[PDB]
Design a protein around this ligand. Structure first.
Ligand code: HEM
Length: 82
């Protein structure tokens, strides 16, 4: 089973208690990761509530970071919004 979120609901998660973002159609809840992110939290908050795939790939994340990102997935972008 997979949970699908719309762009409308994702955009609402960009505040002090909730930070979500999209990477390759998958939705990530990075709320508790902000402080641990090697790159800092400014880059994450700035992209919160939207699709950060291009920025993510632009910086060029390691295979380890990508493996780690998987633990933060909570669902996928609704097919109709793709
Ligand atoms: C769940 C997603 C993410 C995880 C788990 C994550 C993890 C990491 C890790 C482990 C590093 C260390 C270097 C490496 O292994 O590549 C890193 C660096 C970095 N990340 Fe992320 N990252 C994520 C999302 C993002 C996003 C969305 C942005 C930008 C919009 C971003 C910007 C950066 C920057 C600027 C660095 C520093 C690169 C440098 O100094 O050369 N990261 N990230």
């Amino acid at each position: 089973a997979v949970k699908y979120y719309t762009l409308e609901e994702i955009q609402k998660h960009n505040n002090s208690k909730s930070t979500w973002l999209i990477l390759h159609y998958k939705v990530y809840d990075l709320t508790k990761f902000l402080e641990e992110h090697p790159g800092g939290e400014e880059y994450l908050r700035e992209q919160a509530g939207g699709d950060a795939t291009e920025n993510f790939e632009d910086v060029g994340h390691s295979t380890d970071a990508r493996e780690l990102s998987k633990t933060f997935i909570i669902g996928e972008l609704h097919p109709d919004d793709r």
